[PDB]
Design a protein around this motif. Structure first.
Motif, PDB file in Angstrom:
ATOM      1  N   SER A  19       0.785  -1.234   0.000  1.00 13.30           N
ATOM      2  CA  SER A  19       0.000   0.000   0.000  1.00 13.30           C
ATOM      3  C   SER A  19       0.820   1.289   0.000  1.00 13.30           C
ATOM      4  CB  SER A  19      -0.959   0.016   1.190  1.00 13.30           C
ATOM      5  OG  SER A  19      -0.244   0.118   2.409  1.00 13.30           O
ATOM      6  N   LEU A  20       2.024   1.248   0.556  1.00 12.69           N
ATOM      7  CA  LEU A  20       2.870   2.439   0.566  1.00 12.69           C
ATOM      8  C   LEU A  20       3.859   2.412  -0.586  1.00 12.69           C
ATOM      9  CD1 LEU A  20       3.690   3.693   4.149  1.00 12.69           C
ATOM     10  CD2 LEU A  20       2.866   4.958   2.156  1.00 12.69           C
ATOM     11  N   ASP A  48       5.937  11.204  -2.267  1.00  9.07           N
ATOM     12  CA  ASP A  48       5.688   9.867  -2.800  1.00  9.07           C
ATOM     13  C   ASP A  48       4.676   9.134  -1.938  1.00  9.07           C
ATOM     14  OD1 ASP A  48       7.553  10.374  -4.743  1.00  9.07           O
ATOM     15  OD2 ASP A  48       9.119   9.098  -3.879  1.00  9.07           O
ATOM     16  N   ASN A  49       4.777   9.318  -0.626  1.00  6.79           N
ATOM     17  CA  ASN A  49       3.827   8.698   0.289  1.00  6.79           C
ATOM     18  C   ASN A  49       2.393   9.156   0.043  1.00  6.79           C
ATOM     19  OD1 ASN A  49       5.820   7.169   1.532  1.00  6.79           O
ATOM     20  ND2 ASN A  49       6.148   8.656   3.184  1.00  6.79           N
ATOM     21  N   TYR A  50       2.208  10.451  -0.209  1.00  8.62           N
ATOM     22  CA  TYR A  50       0.885  10.999  -0.490  1.00  8.62           C
ATOM     23  C   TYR A  50       0.354  10.531  -1.840  1.00  8.62           C
ATOM     24  CZ  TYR A  50       0.395  14.321   3.398  1.00  8.62           C
ATOM     25  OH  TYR A  50       0.223  14.893   4.640  1.00  8.62           O
ATOM     26  N   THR A  51       1.146  10.763  -2.880  1.00  7.14           N
ATOM     27  CA  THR A  51       0.701  10.652  -4.264  1.00  7.14           C
ATOM     28  C   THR A  51       0.966   9.273  -4.854  1.00  7.14           C
ATOM     29  OG1 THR A  51       2.851  11.396  -5.092  1.00  7.14           O
ATOM     30  CG2 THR A  51       1.225  13.083  -4.602  1.00  7.14           C
ATOM     31  N   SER A  52       1.936   8.570  -4.278  1.00  4.34           N
ATOM     32  CA  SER A  52       2.376   7.295  -4.819  1.00  4.34           C
ATOM     33  C   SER A  52       3.090   7.544  -6.141  1.00  4.34           C
ATOM     34  CB  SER A  52       1.196   6.341  -5.001  1.00  4.34           C
ATOM     35  OG  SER A  52       1.647   5.022  -5.241  1.00  4.34           O
ATOM     36  N   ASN A  75      -5.715  15.602  -3.739  1.00  4.13           N
ATOM     37  CA  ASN A  75      -5.120  14.317  -4.058  1.00  4.13           C
ATOM     38  C   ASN A  75      -6.231  13.314  -4.294  1.00  4.13           C
ATOM     39  OD1 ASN A  75      -3.366  12.204  -4.441  1.00  4.13           O
ATOM     40  ND2 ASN A  75      -2.856  11.951  -2.270  1.00  4.13           N
ATOM     41  N   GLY A 121      -6.721  10.014  -2.605  1.00  2.00           N
ATOM     42  CA  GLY A 121      -5.641  10.040  -1.640  1.00  2.00           C
ATOM     43  C   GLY A 121      -5.838  10.966  -0.455  1.00  2.00           C
ATOM     44  N   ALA A 122      -4.856  10.954   0.433  1.00  2.30           N
ATOM     45  CA  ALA A 122      -4.880  11.807   1.602  1.00  2.30           C
ATOM     46  C   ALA A 122      -4.409  13.212   1.243  1.00  2.30           C
ATOM     47  CB  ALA A 122      -4.013  11.217   2.699  1.00  2.30           C
ATOM     48  N   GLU A 182      -8.044  12.570   6.569  1.00  9.26           N
ATOM     49  CA  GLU A 182      -7.817  11.204   6.108  1.00  9.26           C
ATOM     50  C   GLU A 182      -9.049  10.335   6.358  1.00  9.26           C
ATOM     51  OE1 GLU A 182      -4.281  10.263   8.281  1.00  9.26           O
ATOM     52  OE2 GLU A 182      -2.929  10.729   6.612  1.00  9.26           O
ATOM     53  N   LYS A 203     -12.014  11.467   4.084  1.00 12.87           N
ATOM     54  CA  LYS A 203     -11.795  11.099   2.697  1.00 12.87           C
ATOM     55  C   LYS A 203     -12.115   9.629   2.475  1.00 12.87           C
ATOM     56  CE  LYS A 203      -9.853  12.343  -1.366  1.00 12.87           C
ATOM     57  NZ  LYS A 203     -10.667  12.621  -2.586  1.00 12.87           N
ATOM     58  N   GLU A 224      -7.795   1.099  -0.355  1.00 16.32           N
ATOM     59  CA  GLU A 224      -6.380   1.409  -0.502  1.00 16.32           C
ATOM     60  C   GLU A 224      -5.944   2.509   0.468  1.00 16.32           C
ATOM     61  OE1 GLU A 224      -3.566   0.739  -1.859  1.00 16.32           O
ATOM     62  OE2 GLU A 224      -4.074  -1.084  -2.974  1.00 16.32           O
ATOM     63  N   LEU A 225      -6.680   3.619   0.473  1.00 14.94           N
ATOM     64  CA  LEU A 225      -6.363   4.752   1.335  1.00 14.94           C
ATOM     65  C   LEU A 225      -6.338   4.336   2.801  1.00 14.94           C
ATOM     66  CD1 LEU A 225      -5.598   7.600   1.385  1.00 14.94           C
ATOM     67  CD2 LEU A 225      -8.011   8.297   1.427  1.00 14.94           C
ATOM     68  N   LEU A 285      -5.798   1.289   4.083  1.00 15.80           N
ATOM     69  CA  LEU A 285      -4.596   0.493   4.319  1.00 15.80           C
ATOM     70  C   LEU A 285      -3.342   1.365   4.360  1.00 15.80           C
ATOM     71  CD1 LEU A 285      -5.378  -2.561   2.002  1.00 15.80           C
ATOM     72  CD2 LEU A 285      -5.447  -2.522   4.512  1.00 15.80           C
ATOM     73  N   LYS A 286      -3.211   2.255   3.382  1.00 10.55           N
ATOM     74  CA  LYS A 286      -2.072   3.156   3.326  1.00 10.55           C
ATOM     75  C   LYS A 286      -1.997   3.985   4.606  1.00 10.55           C
ATOM     76  CE  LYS A 286       0.035   5.673  -0.311  1.00 10.55           C
ATOM     77  NZ  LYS A 286      -0.284   6.097  -1.699  1.00 10.55           N
ATOM     78  N   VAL A 287      -3.113   4.605   4.967  1.00 13.21           N
ATOM     79  CA  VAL A 287      -3.157   5.455   6.150  1.00 13.21           C
ATOM     80  C   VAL A 287      -2.785   4.713   7.433  1.00 13.21           C
ATOM     81  CG1 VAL A 287      -4.734   6.560   7.750  1.00 13.21           C
ATOM     82  CG2 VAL A 287      -4.658   7.288   5.357  1.00 13.21           C
ATOM     83  N   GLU A 313       1.038   4.031   7.643  1.00 14.61           N
ATOM     84  CA  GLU A 313       1.747   5.257   7.973  1.00 14.61           C
ATOM     85  C   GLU A 313       1.639   5.583   9.457  1.00 14.61           C
ATOM     86  OE1 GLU A 313       2.262   8.010   4.678  1.00 14.61           O
ATOM     87  OE2 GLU A 313       0.140   7.700   4.206  1.00 14.61           O
TER      88      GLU A 313
END
Lengths: 323, 307
Positions: A23-24, A37-41, A295, A298-299, B237, B240, B255-256, B258-260, B263
């Protein structure tokens, strides 16, 4: 023994776990900034990215950093410069590579360590697939034409930068009759999708923005009669709070001298000018902000970075390393 | 020998240079933050500092840290809690003093070493001149009468901290300023910002947020805002992910999410250190601006930067 439901739920858990694990991951072209990169990939295919900035935020230099990051990935990158020669853009790149001052480099007055280093970076950069276009004020049809042509000529082309789009406001806007930002970005988004590359477009923000108390750009700032831009997947704003603090100080002193407070205005001038001596002594390194204002999928957020003023360079570093 | 004209001239230069250094110095009480000391020249005799913040901004912990710094100087500190017990404030000071986590501290789960380390700080704090006020009851003029006796009581008193004023704020601030001038000491008045602001696109506080119906604050010499971008980043976050869910964009939300979570995991395993802002929104005879602070979440503590 174990039935199809027990197996399936478990197989689902497998891919969800892989999903978590991946995921990251950076799917697109590296930004040059790990937090970004973390935000946008990364910069992904079909994506339209807008980077908005007032003058003095180092937008052109940030772009050339990103250009370099793209070249490292072995992608072919195209760069459109509306208001600047390719030479100036190459110089900015060589400066990043060699860590040689933009002032020293351009003067050509370099020591032997510097020339040696410059010479090596010259040969390195020369091997890279980088395509400049520095014909001024090209319209999007023309830009679109060149990329189509470029893409067909080079399959390796994987990203394009545009520097920069100006925002028209007022009588100028009415008299000038430029293509409007919402329409431009609308066609650029279509082009990105068509060519299947990221397109990064720098936009120089309007002064009116600065009437505001808080001078951090906002999403609505990217507009002109013709509407607010809406088609970019990602919007980054460049903000150097130190530039505005510096101007706030100068303004307050003057205010104070006017209105007849010599006692304090002189005190503030004395204090301010000592903050600046130490600053320049410490390398003129400030805290800046790269704001992820939009984004898609995205976040959203702000990445705090160090801006090395003498190199016009935003510092890439992890949140942990920063701090 | 030496020139008589050239000595009197040097004299004037040394005196003028000393004058230049006198200005350019803190003068007032050390904030505890180099950067903030510079903006305000420390908390000064006769000044009213408003420290404004929403909840989840660690304002009270910031105050105790400040109280701790002011206190180190021989200065005696007066602290007013209008929603908390003095003890609670002391535990916070102790946690800071012994680098012992607050939750571990109040629960009481400390190894022989922790207790030993804490006991010394206990003794140390007892020696300090901090004077505590734990009256739930709050009167603009009640604090006024109470402040005076203490000043008379101790010439070592340095400052008074108020924590905190909800949102007569223009009036209350007014009364504090006249009082602060009369008292000869600075008054730091924590204030809780309205939830209404959250709604604004930009979450970081504004002087207008200080405003109360019929009351807009003017009397404060200095206004400081506490801002943690990371808290609002976490909220956005979450929103969203929820928005995406609601739009039927299930995989994007997934996805968001999991990503969040990854992090945040990395964030925690790195100490939960976030960058935050103390905003200088109002300064008299001084420039406005912002101070970028580290923030130790576990110990709820603002920290200096690397400049």
């Amino acid at each position: 023994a174990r039935n199809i439901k027990e197996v399936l739920e478990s197989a689902m858990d497998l891919i969800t776990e892989n999903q978590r694990k991946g995921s990251l991951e950076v799917t697109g072209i590296p930004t040059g900034f790990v937090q970004l990169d973390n935000y946008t990939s990364g910069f992904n295919k079909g994506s339209l990215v807008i980077i908005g900035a007032r003058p003095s935020m180092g937008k052109t230099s940030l772009m050339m950093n990103m250009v370099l990051s793209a070249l490292n990935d072995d992608r072919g990158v195209a760069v459109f410069s509306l208001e600047m020669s390719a030479e100036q853009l190459a110089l900015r790149a060589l400066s990043d590579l060699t860590s040689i001052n933009m002032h020293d480099l351009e003067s050509g007055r370099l020591d032997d360590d510097q020339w040696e280093n410059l010479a090596k970076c010259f040969d390195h950069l020369s091997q890279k697939k980088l395509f400049f276009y520095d014909k001024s004020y090209v319209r999007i049809e023309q830009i679109r034409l060149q990329l189509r042509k470029l893409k067909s000529q080079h399959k390796e082309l994987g990203i394009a930068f545009i520097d920069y789009l100006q925002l028209m406001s007022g009588s100028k806007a009415t008299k000038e009759r430029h293509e409007q930002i919402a329409e431009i970005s609308r066609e650029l988004k279509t082009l990105a999708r068509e060519l299947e590359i990221p397109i990064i477009a720098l936009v120089q923000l309007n002064r009116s923005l600065e009437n505001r108390d808080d001078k951090r750009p906002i999403l609505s700032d990217i507009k002109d009669s013709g509407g607010i831009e809406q088609d970019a997947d990602i919007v980054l704003f460049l903000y150097r709070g130190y530039i505005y603090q510096m101007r706030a100080e100068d303004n307050k002193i003057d205010k104070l001298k006017k209105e007849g407070k010599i006692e304090e205005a002189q005190e503030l001038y004395l204090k301010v000018n000592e903050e600046r001596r130490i600053h320049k002594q410490n390398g003129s390194i400030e805290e800046a902000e790269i704001i992820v204002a939009k984004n898609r999928n995205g976040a959203t957020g702000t990445v705090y970075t160090r801006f090395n003023a003498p190199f016009t360079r935003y510092e890439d570093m992890p949140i942990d390393s920063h701090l």
